Scaffold this motif. Structure first.
Motif, PDB file in Angstrom:
ATOM      1  N   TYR A   9       0.906  -1.316  -0.158  1.00 19.31           N
ATOM      2  CA  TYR A   9      -0.149  -0.066  -0.078  1.00 19.31           C
ATOM      3  C   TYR A   9       0.922   1.127  -0.030  1.00 19.31           C
ATOM      4  O   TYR A   9       2.120   1.117   0.440  1.00 19.31           O
ATOM      5  CB  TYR A   9      -0.832   0.001   1.322  1.00 19.31           C
ATOM      6  CG  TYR A   9      -0.153   0.451   2.504  1.00 19.31           C
ATOM      7  CD1 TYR A   9       0.530  -0.693   3.163  1.00 19.31           C
ATOM      8  CD2 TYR A   9      -0.213   1.602   3.122  1.00 19.31           C
ATOM      9  CE1 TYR A   9       1.090  -0.683   4.451  1.00 19.31           C
ATOM     10  CE2 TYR A   9       0.585   1.654   4.293  1.00 19.31           C
ATOM     11  CZ  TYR A   9       1.084   0.652   5.147  1.00 19.31           C
ATOM     12  OH  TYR A   9       1.735   0.867   5.942  1.00 19.31           O
ATOM     13  N   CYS A  10       0.287   2.385  -0.461  1.00 18.88           N
ATOM     14  CA  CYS A  10       0.952   3.660  -0.569  1.00 18.88           C
ATOM     15  C   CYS A  10       0.484   4.501   0.581  1.00 18.88           C
ATOM     16  O   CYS A  10      -0.610   3.953   1.389  1.00 18.88           O
ATOM     17  CB  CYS A  10       0.603   4.518  -1.560  1.00 18.88           C
ATOM     18  SG  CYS A  10      -1.136   4.921  -1.995  1.00 18.88           S
ATOM     19  N   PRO A  11       1.147   5.366   1.133  1.00 18.58           N
ATOM     20  CA  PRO A  11       0.797   6.283   2.476  1.00 18.58           C
ATOM     21  C   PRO A  11      -0.527   6.623   2.392  1.00 18.58           C
ATOM     22  O   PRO A  11      -1.387   6.845   3.485  1.00 18.58           O
ATOM     23  CB  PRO A  11       1.891   7.390   2.624  1.00 18.58           C
ATOM     24  CG  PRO A  11       3.252   6.391   1.964  1.00 18.58           C
ATOM     25  CD  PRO A  11       2.724   5.557   0.735  1.00 18.58           C
ATOM     26  N   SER A  12      -1.046   7.061   1.083  1.00 22.75           N
ATOM     27  CA  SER A  12      -2.425   7.454   1.095  1.00 22.75           C
ATOM     28  C   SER A  12      -3.568   6.660   1.450  1.00 22.75           C
ATOM     29  O   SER A  12      -4.622   6.965   1.827  1.00 22.75           O
ATOM     30  CB  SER A  12      -2.666   8.040  -0.365  1.00 22.75           C
ATOM     31  OG  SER A  12      -1.633   9.034  -0.734  1.00 22.75           O
ATOM     32  N   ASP A  13      -3.329   5.218   1.182  1.00 20.79           N
ATOM     33  CA  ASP A  13      -4.519   4.137   1.500  1.00 20.79           C
ATOM     34  C   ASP A  13      -4.044   3.407   2.786  1.00 20.79           C
ATOM     35  O   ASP A  13      -4.750   2.599   2.997  1.00 20.79           O
ATOM     36  CB  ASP A  13      -4.352   3.071   0.372  1.00 20.79           C
ATOM     37  CG  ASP A  13      -4.397   3.694  -1.109  1.00 20.79           C
ATOM     38  OD1 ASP A  13      -5.495   4.436  -1.276  1.00 20.79           O
ATOM     39  OD2 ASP A  13      -4.153   3.111  -1.939  1.00 20.79           O
ATOM     40  N   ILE A  14      -3.508   4.152   3.700  1.00 17.98           N
ATOM     41  CA  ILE A  14      -3.207   3.627   5.136  1.00 17.98           C
ATOM     42  C   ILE A  14      -4.715   3.560   5.728  1.00 17.98           C
ATOM     43  O   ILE A  14      -4.658   2.754   7.015  1.00 17.98           O
ATOM     44  CB  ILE A  14      -2.099   4.441   5.939  1.00 17.98           C
ATOM     45  CG1 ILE A  14      -1.522   3.403   6.950  1.00 17.98           C
ATOM     46  CG2 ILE A  14      -2.640   5.884   6.460  1.00 17.98           C
ATOM     47  CD1 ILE A  14      -0.453   4.297   7.806  1.00 17.98           C
ATOM     48  N   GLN A  15      -5.426   4.424   5.457  1.00 14.54           N
ATOM     49  CA  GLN A  15      -6.555   4.416   6.342  1.00 14.54           C
ATOM     50  C   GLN A  15      -7.656   3.088   5.966  1.00 14.54           C
ATOM     51  O   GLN A  15      -8.346   2.635   6.970  1.00 14.54           O
ATOM     52  CB  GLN A  15      -7.674   5.488   5.883  1.00 14.54           C
ATOM     53  CG  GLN A  15      -6.884   6.897   6.386  1.00 14.54           C
ATOM     54  CD  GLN A  15      -5.847   7.559   5.521  1.00 14.54           C
ATOM     55  OE1 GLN A  15      -5.767   7.011   4.421  1.00 14.54           O
ATOM     56  NE2 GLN A  15      -5.407   8.650   5.970  1.00 14.54           N
ATOM     57  N   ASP A  37       4.676   0.011   7.856  1.00 14.85           N
ATOM     58  CA  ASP A  37       4.594   1.019   9.106  1.00 14.85           C
ATOM     59  C   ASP A  37       4.500   0.803  10.538  1.00 14.85           C
ATOM     60  O   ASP A  37       4.673   1.450  11.364  1.00 14.85           O
ATOM     61  CB  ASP A  37       3.565   2.097   8.659  1.00 14.85           C
ATOM     62  CG  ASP A  37       3.702   2.651   7.143  1.00 14.85           C
ATOM     63  OD1 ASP A  37       5.293   2.958   7.007  1.00 14.85           O
ATOM     64  OD2 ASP A  37       3.046   3.062   6.596  1.00 14.85           O
ATOM     65  N   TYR A  69      -1.903   4.317  -5.600  1.00 12.40           N
ATOM     66  CA  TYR A  69      -0.878   3.138  -5.695  1.00 12.40           C
ATOM     67  C   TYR A  69      -0.067   3.185  -6.697  1.00 12.40           C
ATOM     68  O   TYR A  69       1.057   2.751  -6.819  1.00 12.40           O
ATOM     69  CB  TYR A  69      -1.801   1.986  -5.637  1.00 12.40           C
ATOM     70  CG  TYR A  69      -0.992   0.914  -6.147  1.00 12.40           C
ATOM     71  CD1 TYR A  69      -0.262   0.099  -5.217  1.00 12.40           C
ATOM     72  CD2 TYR A  69      -1.490   0.269  -7.269  1.00 12.40           C
ATOM     73  CE1 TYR A  69       0.230  -1.088  -5.872  1.00 12.40           C
ATOM     74  CE2 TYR A  69      -0.873  -0.977  -7.875  1.00 12.40           C
ATOM     75  CZ  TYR A  69       0.179  -1.552  -6.968  1.00 12.40           C
ATOM     76  OH  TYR A  69       0.471  -2.709  -7.577  1.00 12.40           O
ATOM     77  N   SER A  72       3.229   5.219  -6.788  1.00  9.79           N
ATOM     78  CA  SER A  72       4.181   4.822  -5.707  1.00  9.79           C
ATOM     79  C   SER A  72       5.246   3.891  -6.447  1.00  9.79           C
ATOM     80  O   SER A  72       4.783   2.947  -7.284  1.00  9.79           O
ATOM     81  CB  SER A  72       3.376   3.970  -4.514  1.00  9.79           C
ATOM     82  OG  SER A  72       4.589   3.395  -3.782  1.00  9.79           O
ATOM     83  N   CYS A  75       5.656   0.425  -4.048  1.00 14.21           N
ATOM     84  CA  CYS A  75       4.459  -0.577  -4.415  1.00 14.21           C
ATOM     85  C   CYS A  75       4.841  -1.310  -5.892  1.00 14.21           C
ATOM     86  O   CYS A  75       4.489  -2.318  -6.057  1.00 14.21           O
ATOM     87  CB  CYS A  75       3.452   0.217  -4.253  1.00 14.21           C
ATOM     88  SG  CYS A  75       2.871   1.195  -2.660  1.00 14.21           S
TER      89      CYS A  75
END
Length: 138
Positions: A9-15, A37, A69, A72, A75
């Motif tokens: 995953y990219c940091p934008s999809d951590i939610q 992370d 994604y 990135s 990824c």
């Protein structure tokens, strides 16, 4: 030591990764997901620790596909390294997931493997069931 799946995953999809932790780890499935992370220790080579976890310390690998994604590069390396372990998906190791509306094309190298679709309102009931079953098989 041994994880059930690596989460690409990219940091934008951590939610959405937090949802994947609540739905799979904190429930009765009791899956052991590997989040970089959280579980990857600092000081490790980002390519060597990914090559060591995806290939030997994680049975499968989940790819959170989105528009962010694609941008990135880390990824991109993990996705292509996952395909290299079994091109053609003979071992069912690469599990792509679409949870968000994408206005870009799905990765062409992953267009022949079944995707767990979270945006279709007619199949949301079987999303987590199919996902937790694929990560549970040996």
């Amino acid at each position: 030591e041994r994880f059930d799946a690596f989460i690409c995953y990219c940091p934008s999809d951590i939610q959405f990764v937090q949802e994947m932790i609540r739905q799979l780890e904190q429930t009765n499935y009791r899956l052991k997901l590997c989040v970089s992370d959280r579980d990857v220790l600092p000081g490790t080579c980002v390519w060597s620790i990914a090559s060591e976890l995806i290939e030997k310390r994680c049975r499968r690998m989940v790819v959170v596909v989105s528009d962010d994604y694609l941008q990135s590069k880390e990824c991109d390396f993990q996705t292509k390294f996952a395909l290299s372990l079994s091109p053609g998906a003979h071992q069912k190791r690469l599990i792509p997931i679409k949870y968000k509306a994408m206005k870009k094309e799905f990765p062409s190298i992953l267009r022949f493997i079944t995707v767990c679709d979270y945006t279709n309102p007619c199949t949301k009931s079987w999303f987590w069931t199919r996902l937790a079953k694929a990560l549970s098989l040996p």
